[PDB]
Amino acid sequence: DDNTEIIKSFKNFILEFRLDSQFIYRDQLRNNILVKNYSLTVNMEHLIGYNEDIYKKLSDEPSDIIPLFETAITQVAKRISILSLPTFQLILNSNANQIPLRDLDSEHVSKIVRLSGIIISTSVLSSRATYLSIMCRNCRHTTSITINNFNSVSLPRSCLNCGPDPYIIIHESSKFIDQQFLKLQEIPELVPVGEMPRNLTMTCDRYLTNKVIPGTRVTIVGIYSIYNSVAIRTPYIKILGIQSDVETSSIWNSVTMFTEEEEEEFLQLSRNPKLYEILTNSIAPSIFGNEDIKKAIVCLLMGGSKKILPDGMRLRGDINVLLLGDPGTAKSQLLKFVEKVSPIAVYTSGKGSSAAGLTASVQRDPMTREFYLEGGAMVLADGGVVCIDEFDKMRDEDRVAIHEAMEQQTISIAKAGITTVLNSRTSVLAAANPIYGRYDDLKSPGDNIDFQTTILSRFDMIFIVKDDHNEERDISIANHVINIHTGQEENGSEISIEKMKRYITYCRLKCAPRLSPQAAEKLSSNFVTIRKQLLINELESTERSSIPITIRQLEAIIRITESLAKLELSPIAQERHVDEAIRLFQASTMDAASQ
Amino acid sequence: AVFGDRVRRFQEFLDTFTSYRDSVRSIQVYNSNNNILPHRIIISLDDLREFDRSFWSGILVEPAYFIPPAEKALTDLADSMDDVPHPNASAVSSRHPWKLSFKGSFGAHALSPRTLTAQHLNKLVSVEGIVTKTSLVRPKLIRSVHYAAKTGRFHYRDYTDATTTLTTRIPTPAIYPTEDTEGNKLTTEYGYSTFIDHQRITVQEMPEMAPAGQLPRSIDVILDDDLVDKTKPGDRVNVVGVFKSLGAGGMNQSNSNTLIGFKTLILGNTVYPLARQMLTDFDIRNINKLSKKKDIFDILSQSLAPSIYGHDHIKKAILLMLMGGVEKNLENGSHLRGDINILMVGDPSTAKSQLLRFVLNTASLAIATTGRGSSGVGLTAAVTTDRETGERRLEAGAMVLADRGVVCIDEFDKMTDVDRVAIHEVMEQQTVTIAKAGIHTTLNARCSVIAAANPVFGQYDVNRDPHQNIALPDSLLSRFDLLFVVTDDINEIRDRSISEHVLRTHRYLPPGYLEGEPVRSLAVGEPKLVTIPFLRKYVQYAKERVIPQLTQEAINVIVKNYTDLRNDDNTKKSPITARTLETLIRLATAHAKVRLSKTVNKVDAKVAANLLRFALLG
Amino acid sequence: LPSIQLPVDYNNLFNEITDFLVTFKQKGPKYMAMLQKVANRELNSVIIDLDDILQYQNEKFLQGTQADDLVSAIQQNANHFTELFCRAIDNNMPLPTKEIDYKDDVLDVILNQRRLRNERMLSD
DNA sequence: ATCTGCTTTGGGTGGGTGGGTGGGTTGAGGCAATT
DNA sequence: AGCAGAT
Ligand SMILES: Nc1ncnc2c1ncn2[C@@H]1O[C@H](COP(=O)(O)OP(=O)(O)OP(=O)(O)O)[C@@H](O)[C@H]1O
Numbered sequence A: 001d002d003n004t005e006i007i008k009s010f011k012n013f014i015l016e017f018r019l020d021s022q023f024i025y026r027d028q029l030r031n032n033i034l035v036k037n038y039s040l041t042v043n044m045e046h047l048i049g050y051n052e053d054i055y056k057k058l059s060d061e062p063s064d065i066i067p068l069f070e071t072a073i074t075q076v077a078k079r080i081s082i083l084s085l086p087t088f089q090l091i092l093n094s095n096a097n098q099i100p101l102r103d104l105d106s107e108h109v110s111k112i113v114r115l116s117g118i119i120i121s122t123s124v125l126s127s128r129a130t131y132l133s134i135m136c137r138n139c140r141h142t143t144s145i146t147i148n149n150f151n152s153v154s155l156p157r158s159c160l161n162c163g164p165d166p167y168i169i170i171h172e173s174s175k176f177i178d179q180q181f182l183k184l185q186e187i188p189e190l191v192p193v194g195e196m197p198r199n200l201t202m203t204c205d206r207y208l209t210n211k212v213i214p215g216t217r218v219t220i221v222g223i224y225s226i227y228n229s230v231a232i233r234t235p236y237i238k239i240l241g242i243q244s245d246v247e248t249s250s251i252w253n254s255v256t257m258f259t260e261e262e263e264e265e266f267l268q269l270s271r272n273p274k275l276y277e278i279l280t281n282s283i284a285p286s287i288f289g290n291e292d293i294k295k296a297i298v299c300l301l302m303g304g305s306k307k308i309l310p311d312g313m314r315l316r317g318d319i320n321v322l323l324l325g326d327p328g329t330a331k332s333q334l335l336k337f338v339e340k341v342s343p344i345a346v347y348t349s350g351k352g353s354s355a356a357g358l359t360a361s362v363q364r365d366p367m368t369r370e371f372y373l374e375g376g377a378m379v380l381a382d383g384g385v386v387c388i389d390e391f392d393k394m395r396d397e398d399r400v401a402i403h404e405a406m407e408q409q410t411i412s413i414a415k416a417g418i419t420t421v422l423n424s425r426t427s428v429l430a431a432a433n434p435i436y437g438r439y440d441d442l443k444s445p446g447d448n449i450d451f452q453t454t455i456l457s458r459f460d461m462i463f464i465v466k467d468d469h470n471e472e473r474d475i476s477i478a479n480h481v482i483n484i485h486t487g488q489e490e491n492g493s494e495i496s497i498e499k500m501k502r503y504i505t506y507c508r509l510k511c512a513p514r515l516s517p518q519a520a521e522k523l524s525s526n527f528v529t530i531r532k533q534l535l536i537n538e539l540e541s542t543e544r545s546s547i548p549i550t551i552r553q554l555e556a557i558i559r560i561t562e563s564l565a566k567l568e569l570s571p572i573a574q575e576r577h578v579d580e581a582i583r584l585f586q587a588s589t590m591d592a593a594s595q
Numbered sequence B: 001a002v003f004g005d006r007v008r009r010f011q012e013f014l015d016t017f018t019s020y021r022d023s024v025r026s027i028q029v030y031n032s033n034n035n036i037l038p039h040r041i042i043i044s045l046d047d048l049r050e051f052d053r054s055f056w057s058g059i060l061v062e063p064a065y066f067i068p069p070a071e072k073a074l075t076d077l078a079d080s081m082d083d084v085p086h087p088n089a090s091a092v093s094s095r096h097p098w099k100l101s102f103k104g105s106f107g108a109h110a111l112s113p114r115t116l117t118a119q120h121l122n123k124l125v126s127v128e129g130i131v132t133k134t135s136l137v138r139p140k141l142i143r144s145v146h147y148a149a150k151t152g153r154f155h156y157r158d159y160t161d162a163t164t165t166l167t168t169r170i171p172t173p174a175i176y177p178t179e180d181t182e183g184n185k186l187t188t189e190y191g192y193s194t195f196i197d198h199q200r201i202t203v204q205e206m207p208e209m210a211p212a213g214q215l216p217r218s219i220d221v222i223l224d225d226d227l228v229d230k231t232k233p234g235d236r237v238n239v240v241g242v243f244k245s246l247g248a249g250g251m252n253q254s255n256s257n258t259l260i261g262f263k264t265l266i267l268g269n270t271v272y273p274l275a276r277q278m279l280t281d282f283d284i285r286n287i288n289k290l291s292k293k294k295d296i297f298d299i300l301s302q303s304l305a306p307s308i309y310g311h312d313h314i315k316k317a318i319l320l321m322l323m324g325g326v327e328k329n330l331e332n333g334s335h336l337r338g339d340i341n342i343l344m345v346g347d348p349s350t351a352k353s354q355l356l357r358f359v360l361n362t363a364s365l366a367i368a369t370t371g372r373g374s375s376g377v378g379l380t381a382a383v384t385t386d387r388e389t390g391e392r393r394l395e396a397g398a399m400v401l402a403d404r405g406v407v408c409i410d411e412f413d414k415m416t417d418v419d420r421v422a423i424h425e426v427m428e429q430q431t432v433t434i435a436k437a438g439i440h441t442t443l444n445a446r447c448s449v450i451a452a453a454n455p456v457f458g459q460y461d462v463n464r465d466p467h468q469n470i471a472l473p474d475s476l477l478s479r480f481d482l483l484f485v486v487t488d489d490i491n492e493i494r495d496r497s498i499s500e501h502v503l504r505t506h507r508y509l510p511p512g513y514l515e516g517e518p519v520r521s522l523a524v525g526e527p528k529l530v531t532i533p534f535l536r537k538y539v540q541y542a543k544e545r546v547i548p549q550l551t552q553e554a555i556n557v558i559v560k561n562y563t564d565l566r567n568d569d570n571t572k573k574s575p576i577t578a579r580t581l582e583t584l585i586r587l588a589t590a591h592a593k594v595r596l597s598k599t600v601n602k603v604d605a606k607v608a609a610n611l612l613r614f615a616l617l618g
Numbered sequence C: 001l002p003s004i005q006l007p008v009d010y011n012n013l014f015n016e017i018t019d020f021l022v023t024f025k026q027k028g029p030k031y032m033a034m035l036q037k038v039a040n041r042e043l044n045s046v047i048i049d050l051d052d053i054l055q056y057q058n059e060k061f062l063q064g065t066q067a068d069d070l071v072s073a074i075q076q077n078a079n080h081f082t083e084l085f086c087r088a089i090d091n092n093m094p095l096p097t098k099e100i101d102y103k104d105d106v107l108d109v110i111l112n113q114r115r116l117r118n119e120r121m122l123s124d
Numbered sequence D: 001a002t003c004t005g006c007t008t009t010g011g012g013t014g015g016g017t018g019g020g021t022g023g024g025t026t027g028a029g030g031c032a033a034t035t
Numbered sequence E: 001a002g003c004a005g006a007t
């Protein structure tokens, strides 16, 4: 009765909506059916413009009208693609105000809401039924049921004598769809005073599955509903749309999510003669000086290139950076910026961490009594960067639990039957203090550093930041900080965080330069000289150097060269990059070792 | 109606291709002569596609409606072939139809546990992964036969379940009939009833193929009858079966969730291993021709890890470890092991971990473990409960899973004493004794241990004695055949050579790729460096069909070397002991294996002596 | 409950079992002596040696009177043959040779009283 | 006297507004006190 | 299937 009229109304929107000379939804449908994507994304501002009455119904009773807009889409799709196809999914976009995760309460039950959060977990896909074929136990009578996944359905209780519940499902004739579960945590800043962050369970269907990964900020449009698991119901959100700032699909598979128009911008930016300067200036615009550390951070974000030799050996392609220095140097602020610019990043404190917190931990499911594996900081940061602050407060065991994941980029587990070798391809950016809090020049370098040579050799570049009291520099820093406190270039000398992050993603998924012979000869000669320099320094002092120079440093120089080449989308690394890489190595690691 | 037509169409297919008929006849003949081959046939999906496209498409997309007809046609053919004169009553009552198994090329149905979605339900798929669990084998009732004493006639009943057939039927509780239709007493005849085995395994996605920041997923599989014990945990398999769903999935009013999906799993048809290489006559002749060379040992050793510069002696030791020794157990009870254990201690960045990884990749069986990532229980075995039957059992650990293989332990010095005790016991006795949860047993763990450790101060110190440099107990140290101490000594020529080698290695580009391109099957049935595959074939051949025996000349060499080594003024990085004699004999035997010889000669003794002397006195 | 026609008849097998028990010899018949000992309360366990059954079968074949394969039938389905053999022994249990205190046994008195009650009921 | 109807084993195809003085018991990981 | 209740 009314259902047919509602279906007719939503069908006329898809067939009559033109903003100029193009039918936006009719053409979107045809283009989607051609690539086998049975869905239509509709913007709710367009529906409020066609007929406000249709929006009033879709917002007053969402779980009753949404199922009738899907069938209208399916009918129009059949009319457009078939010359005389499952039920089509409807994905919604809205610009309504976002309700804070913790402000959702009884006043929003069964209503369309928009909210943001952080995805902390994702489930293994399940299978939900969409068309059952049933039969009767006694008289063997065949029937079918059709189900929409919008709850306010079960097998018939009485046959069509036959006892109660006479119907058994015939599986080889039924059809199913995909279902996923997500946990959404509220943003750290939104949380009220003295409160732990709160979770919320979410479910997505069909083409909204496998769209997010744990640890990524997302925006959700859905229905705040309830399901019975006494007179209380556990709330949850039925997703109707997902929007994210991270192209997770490009990151897991190939290069994707870059439009040709967007791609053209990246090539134009790469063609800039002084992209290195722009990127260096774009990191921490509010921190004065420390240019070398900012260049090192650019190289770390860019990364090197990984090689798999024919015999099977793999060569690490990531760069690890350590910041040792005195208080007030802005190491923690640099780490907090790097966590915010990188596409994937985790900020962790060495004190509030553990060996299982990093890597992976073995957990027991209370229901199935079965042990399973949950990823830690280094798994949650896979393919990105881990910012381990307070690296000196970490316990010896928890620090030792990081060697293999830092070098081999794998997390071997052998616990509770579970036996595996996970993958953790992450870059470590660590900040630490010397033993006495300040780097005391009076005592030998072996007295100011408690890190063992094994852990230190795993860092590509080591920065020993010393705070020297110079009146000119002090006045400059005072002026800069006061300007910050009392007080937008965007004129080719700096790019916002979003653009820089997208450019990092593009470069990582598009380029992997290789060394030319001249660079190889140059780097090889430099390694021989540096090793001789360590030996002359060692012969002079009975004490064995605390900062080592092993083959890992040669590989680190190669990685820095490759990252500098990749920064400009150059398929080959030339001497103009080798010189910069050698300069950075001398400015950080040989500088630390010389003292 | 349609079923009979399809049975006729499949029967016409089996007639056109005679290989399946010949295989069935050979199976029946072998069974008649007799230990017993199962009633299974492997058909090529390519041949079916060439013969009748509709049948091939149906078997790939609607297996439920097309596989049972083919199985019935095959059974009818086999029955028409059968010529057994006298059938035993069990055979007459037996319910043993012929089962069908597939091979060939699955176009888009070749998937992995991560890519299996609801779109693939009720379809023939092939899945690849690691077997992580394996329930216990329990018989499953299918047919029961009874006897009515008064009436003097036998009756029978047929049972079906959701996992024993592809078409949905009414469930049959396992209650045995007790009274005849007319009220006669019925006595079950178990010897004539039909039970089949049943097992459930879990297949996990390969960890290295997983996405970024996601743990691998798994799927449940069912194997019945002759596919019951073809896999063990830690094996790489390719499973073919039908993807299904079971149960009511919350549609029954008892479950009030309303947000839980249906159960799903695969009924397997075939299992394909992915561990032993099949040797050809050409390969065997090439192996022999190479073995006749006088410098085969050097060639094979250098061929190991071509991208690691230097470390010749460690590579030789790794080769001898891959070959192994000869295991002897005496009548009295003494059980001498023929495995070689190796320990590497050295300064950071000396290629210890890369050598471990190469051994992991080359060896036929190898398990990877670290110091802080493992545990005492995770190395030996764990007590869990079986989901299928709810019975207490043991799950094999890293050491047990690597039986008759190799276990690579990285960061040997970062382990705990409690976890070190388990490895101490395993290396000392080569077995695992378990006393937990009312379980008493002894699992076999006969594996070679290759480990890498760091000195106490992170860098070997020449001044301090070896005891002060290594934190491991002396008792644990005495169980390693060869202790290699490697130091990073800065030199000009050596540094230039190593740097040039590394730079050359870093410039490799794999064929099929352009400069600046970052690095990323078709069927299921299926002084020159020696390639790794040929090295694997050589090792397999040599350690499979060579058992060298000692000879008086090697005996004199070994006794002279031991006598001189023990009472000599020069200090040793490890203390000489009677265990050194066993290590010498083991190394000589392994080198004899390398040459494909049935006897240990002077040359093998002289090679073992030189290797041990390098290990002990640099 | 459909039916099949298996190539086993339990009547010939029962006759064979009885003949084996009463006639087989390896003194008098071995199994009859064992039954005599069982009747006198001396023995409480009868063990059937399948070797003896095979020997009896082959002796019958040599005599020319071929019979059914008892050993294979027992091996293939053994639960039924326990009851069959027990019935055969029950039929051919010899009378005791040594007097025993029947009245001491509870079961003897109980069954005697049951017989008396049945006789009284029949007389009515 | 006949017809109508619920619930097990023990286990996650009942659960955590029923709990652990109603049983399902090893394995791992974090924390205080002990060192 | 055994036992607990309403007509
Ligand atoms: N250019 C700057 N240089 C140094 N500190 C700065 C600068 N700009 C701001 N700050 C201040 O630095 C403070 C942050 O501390 P910072 O990151 O310098 O410490 P740290 O040296 O890394 O740590 P710790 O003192 O524990 O060793 C903030 O108060 C920020 O206001």
Ligand SMILES: Nc1ncnc2c1ncn2[C@@H]1O[C@H](COP(=O)(O)OP(=O)(O)OP(=O)(O)O)[C@@H](O)[C@H]1O
Binding pocket: A315, A316, A403, A407, A454, A551, A552, A555, B307, B308, B309, B310, B347, B348, B349, B350, B351, B352, B353, B354, B355, B452, B454, B498, B502
């Ligand atoms: N001889 C060598 N030839 C080539 N590469 C080498 C060599 N020695 C070390 N390397 C390089 O060392 C890098 C890392 O060192 P590796 O992990 O193999 O050392 P390790 O002995 O296990 O060190 P650690 O004590 O830190 O665990 C590898 O990328 C490898 O390229």
Ligand SMILES: [Mg+2]
Binding pocket: A331, A332, A389, A431
């Ligand atoms: Mg700080």
Ligand SMILES: [Mg+2]
Binding pocket: B352, B353, B410, B452
């Ligand atoms: Mg290592």
Ligand SMILES: [Zn+2]
Binding pocket: A136, A137, A138, A139, A140, A141, A159, A160, A162, A166
């Ligand atoms: Zn009915």
